[PDB]
């Protein structure tokens, strides 16, 4: 039978009993005393493995089990039985009917995994799963809302030599305990549950941080909501300021060198004390001997050296209110100050990390674990990628406790690691609101001069050009665009057009305002501005495309930005305002009049759109029409969702804590994807076996052509010899694989799709069709991308090998030349000819030992531990020299392999997809891009070009230069009074952003000196040290967060000391005076720059007064 219920025989377990109706199975259970009155029911579906032991264990635990085998019509059994949970050995997806039933009934769905090998082989595999098997076992079920991808089943051999599937005995106990823990949340009273919450805090006196969120008020609101719901919370303070003071007093973390600080904390913070017996019992119960032996080898015997009493106990910092506990997250590594990774050894966490998590599991005996914000570091510990075993740290540290994780909708790429490696359930929260830059009144007279120039009918237009040039040079714009500043040499038409486009881009930039607090909606003005930002550009660009396709005079609007603003942006804004005033105007006649189409054309477009869910022009016309229709229709829904989301977040969190079901959702910020509202849902990703999709291919081709055209324009019509790429995960998920398309088109290879839409083969483009020589590529990746899509790397390497062997080309083949040069370089280094020939084709690289980052930020920000950039280049070459181009040579390190592949490199490309961060507001951007740039400059001896792929506007993707982007970001955010005044209405979390931006600016100046000017440092000094805008920022920093001001002053002084900034004596004196005054008044914060840099300390002391210097030195020496 194909649809049945099954069970194992009682007298004879070998043969199987089959039943066609639920009544027969119930009678069979009652005959054999398998039925218990009032017990909860569990249904088991699937065919991937043999589940006899699981059924027996669940029955012994005290449940009623229904094993159902039905591939298609399994909903009838579920509706007849009405279980309390569903366990699925998934192969594919179940459908929307299951999601509707789960939402209606509010029950859970689980999905364990199966391994098709022996246990010994599985425990030694560094990957676990990859490809179609991983897509069918993990990726697809997440679209239904499954949780806990736990590895349970494996295979064994008998005497004859036959493979048999079974369940590993050690995993079964943990799985059953987890099921019991999840089911007990529904019946236990709220007054008796115990909850643990984890937050992230900076060292010393720094503030709490999360991605775009104000942390302390959100925590206070959450605690108030929990107290209202009926939980046992006592001792809560009056307001959030008192909570912040208490957290600072009793919840701080310290670095290794600040012995005095935590020695003082031991006698004032009242921490939890752990003895040796408890720790040893917990370790024996939880971990394995070999991993603990590794920990002992790395750090020594218990308790270690960090926060230990003289008696021999360990101290844990926590803050407890009744049955709720708050804890900070410690460091997952060691401050050995050795920046080069040793190949062949992993990193084990110190004693404090393990002690905290084991005390949560066994000492506090928590019923629920919560991670508060984006993002922690638990899910980035070693070793395996997916399908973890008992040797992996996240699996052991999480245990069998329900796990919830608060995450932002703008960082979908990194949530998959938390979902798949720590078994967490994600809860989405919003992003900060958007507004206009309001800088149109500063660059107005320049626009008037340009307008006067454009309307001159004179044959000789030079004086107007001279006036425009004078105004441009006065404002310093010529440095951003790479123009000249000669006395009597007028500009040409193209340069003036570039200046006008730059100014218009400045005028229409969107910025973020005050940070987001849970339980508090935006201001009505911010609601209006966000709804304005979410709807204007789609309508404008779709109308422009529709006008272009019909053959209208769109050349002027495509050539100038002012014309486009005056012809397509203002009418869209007016229409959006009208629709926002009265949502009932959205009629088909309005659509047909706005798009200038007849109703029959609209019907045809709707028919085409429905069929796709014809020639190419019809398809694109229908797509534009559908975009216009959706954007017009959903304005009121946007506003309502924005107004209603904050309450839904708290309600969903409470429902999840009571053991309910959380609905799935996609990811992305509201501007890029409006389908992410309302929030409070669980995010999923795309299938990597179908990438690059049909839509991403054309965009990749266009971007590659734009890159080639720009390089030819800047270098006298010469094409590049080799191009470098960096691959990340979020843009891969949100674009469909456009960067891979760019790489493949640069090589000259195209994908081949089967009948199911999966890409599994490659084809060579003829040289005549290409119209240009082939160009070689080199690629670097991050850990998240390697986890998400590993087969695409194999495709890329295979494409490189295929293109290197193409002969009889009309144009030159540069891939073969690159291979020959790499082989020669390897030969001159002292390698065997066979090894050199084998290695001369490696082109995909990543972090050593499988780490997720580059490890270069720690070396750059330790200014007193290096002198030249060559040391940084060597460290970067060592730390990112592993190879990930094939499965048989997965994670193999060869000396000089990375260096030989970087020869003859001309361009560096970095993707960008989010509207919330830029080049100066994210540290990973400089960490990767500037590191690659520095390595290329050190290897080849010439500084390459740097470009950014702008995906932010899904209807208009483009390519931009790095220095222009830096200029735009600097002119729009940190030197803009509107941004500063909007930020000055927050707290400490808002105040940390300035220090973060200054640190990133210092890092960029270190990596690529030519991209940072002295005038930028001068402007920052004028704004933040002299207060030329008359905003009163010093008082704001004093009343909110002095540590940020200390950090900013220290960073500027370090830049002055290293020679990167050519400051004068007065500026140095003022900075030193301010730094010493703040440190003396408000005590040191002790970050890396302030309390761990001797040369900077001496430099600061030498520039100040003698008594002030002595007081500053004695203040510094107290913490060490
Ligand atoms: Na940093
Ligand atoms: Na990060």
Numbering used by the authors: 164 to 776, 899 to 1405
Provide the authors' own sentences about this structure as they appear in the paper.
Here, we provide direct physiological, biochemical, and structural evidence for the anaerobic removal of iron from heme by HmuS, a membrane-bound, NADH-dependent de-chelatase that deconstructs heme to protoporphyrin IX (PPIX) and Fe(II). HmuS de-chelatase shares the overall 6-domain architecture of these class I chelatases, including the N-terminal “head” (domain I) and “neck” (domain II) domains, followed by domains III–VI, which collectively form the body.
Cryo-EM single particle analysis was used to determine two related structures of HmuS, each at a global resolution of 2.6 Å. With the exception of a disordered N-terminal domain in the second structure, they are highly similar. In this context, density for the head domain in the initial single particle map was relatively well ordered, but significantly weaker than the rest of the structure. Notably, the ordered structure retains strong density for the heme group at the interface of the head and neck domains. In contrast, heme density is absent in the disordered structure. His-538 in the first motif and His-1209 in the second extend toward each other, directly across the middle of the putative active site, where they coordinate a strong spherical density, which we have modeled as a sodium cation due to the inclusion of NaCl in the buffer (EV4 and EV5). The flexible hinge connecting the head domain to the neck and the proximity of the MRI suggest that ferric heme can access a binding site at the head/neck interface, possibly fed by the MRI.
